[PDB]
Write a structure and sequence with these properties.
The structure is a homodimer of 115-residue chains. Helices cover 63% and strands 0% of the residues of chain A. With 115 residues, chain A is mostly helical. The first copy, chain A, has a single domain (1-115), classed as Four Helix Bundle (Hemerythrin (Met), subunit A) (Up-down Bundle), CATH 1.20.120.310. The two termini of chain A are 29 Å apart. The interface between A and B is medium-sized, with 35 and 35 residues. The complex binds flavin-adenine dinucleotide (2 copies). The PDB classes it as flavoprotein.
């Protein structure tokens, strides 16, 4: 019941996926070379400091198997959605439909259910 | 009432301070030179992509005025608490007592109110 407590692994995960998907949703459609480098490196550095060891190793192996595609906002928001679905699958959670990621993390649902 | 909606600036901020303070709380007490460099750069890259423009410019000016101290976990968790209090003050919110940051973001309150 006490809200201002350290978050657990699941709470830290929800915070972290919200931060990552939100950063992705606003990344440029046409990023410069340096922004593309900087986002890849951000993701790398995120995985280095993520404080759940099991999460982070798993994750660093995932990233080795599937490198951040930061060429454009489309590629990068989708890449990150595919990444997050691998973690969902690993954990027995259903796939998120990646075609909804702009709705979910930038624009809101088209039916107006977020307004 | 619909929970799976894009977060607003305040919601994105709570997610983001939770992610940052949590990363800090678990940073090493004796980080290697490369970890020290990597955390400074992480913070820099975070400020580059943070998607609230007003938040980010403000923030990039703050960081120019007061560089991330990543020499140790003590210095870095405190630095980040001081940073977050400047944003609190800017916004008319009261100071967070930085002496509580291990309790709040790693260990839980000493009275056991998080157990
Ligand atoms: C980088 C990272 C690695 C992690 N590794 C582990 C691990 O190894 N083991 C472990 O137990 N936990 C791990 N976690 C935590 C875990 O993924 C969940 O965050 C936590 O279990 C809470 O799950 P949840 O059901 O609340 O939804 P979350 O997975 O946290 O998702 C939050 C919301 O995002 C939306 N969403 C779901 N999937 C996608 C998607 N593919 N794309 C866009 N939006 C989506 C949905 O609205 C969902 O409610 C990791 C978290 C992160 C950020
Ligand atoms: C980097 C960054 C820059 C931002 N810039 C702006 C801006 O320019 N303008 C704007 O309107 N909003 C900005 N925000 C959002 C803003 O700071 C708040 O997150 C948002 O207004 C919600 O505030 P809150 O009252 O819910 O608590 P938050 O400030 O989000 O804090 C969440 C919790 O952290 C704990 N806490 C509070 N202070 C500290 C501290 N100093 N150290 C450790 N723990 C603490 C408390 O438990 C608090 O409830 C920024 C957010 C971030 C992450």
């Amino acid at each position: 019941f006490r809200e201002d407590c350290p978050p657990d692994r699941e709470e830290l995960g929800r915070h972290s996926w919200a931060v990552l998907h939100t950063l992705a949703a606003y990344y440029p459609d046409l990023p410069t070379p340096e922004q593309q480098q900087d986002m890849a490196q951000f993701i790398h550095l995120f995985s280095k400091f993520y404080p759940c060891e099991e999460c982070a190793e798993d994750l660093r192996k995932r990233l080795a198997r599937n490198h951040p595609d930061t060429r454009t906002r489309a590629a990068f928001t989708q890449w990150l959605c595919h990444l997050h679905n691998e973690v969902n699958r690993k954990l027995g959670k259903p796939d998120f439909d990646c075609s909804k990621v702009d709705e979910r993390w930038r624009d809101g649902w088209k039916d107006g259910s977020c307004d």
